[PDB]
Amino acid sequence: GCLEFWWKCNPNDDKCCRPKLKCSKLFKLCNFSF
User: Where along the chain do its domains lie?
Assistant: First the structure.
Protein backbone atom coordinates (compact mmCIF):
# COMPACT_ATOMS: atom_id res chain seq x y z
CA GLY A 1 0.00 0.00 0.00
CA CYS A 2 1.29 3.51 -0.75
CA LEU A 3 0.20 7.14 -0.27
CA GLU A 4 -1.57 9.34 -2.85
CA PHE A 5 -0.22 11.21 -5.90
CA TRP A 6 0.40 14.26 -3.66
CA TRP A 7 1.10 13.16 -0.06
CA LYS A 8 4.03 14.30 2.09
CA CYS A 9 7.22 12.44 1.13
CA ASN A 10 10.99 12.18 1.58
CA PRO A 11 13.71 10.97 -0.80
CA ASN A 12 15.28 9.42 2.32
CA ASP A 13 12.01 7.77 3.44
CA ASP A 14 9.04 8.39 1.11
CA LYS A 15 6.06 6.07 0.50
CA CYS A 16 4.08 7.55 -2.42
CA CYS A 17 2.76 4.90 -4.81
CA ARG A 18 5.51 3.88 -7.25
CA PRO A 19 3.39 3.28 -10.38
CA LYS A 20 4.43 6.70 -11.71
CA LEU A 21 5.12 9.26 -8.94
CA LYS A 22 8.03 10.63 -6.90
CA CYS A 23 8.47 12.96 -3.89
CA SER A 24 8.56 16.64 -4.91
CA LYS A 25 10.47 19.36 -3.03
CA LEU A 26 8.24 21.98 -4.69
CA PHE A 27 5.85 21.34 -1.77
CA LYS A 28 7.33 18.36 0.11
CA LEU A 29 4.69 16.09 -1.48
CA CYS A 30 4.88 13.29 -4.06
CA ASN A 31 4.00 14.00 -7.70
CA PHE A 32 4.95 13.29 -11.31
CA SER A 33 2.25 12.55 -13.92
CA PHE A 34 -1.06 11.83 -12.14
Answer: 1-34
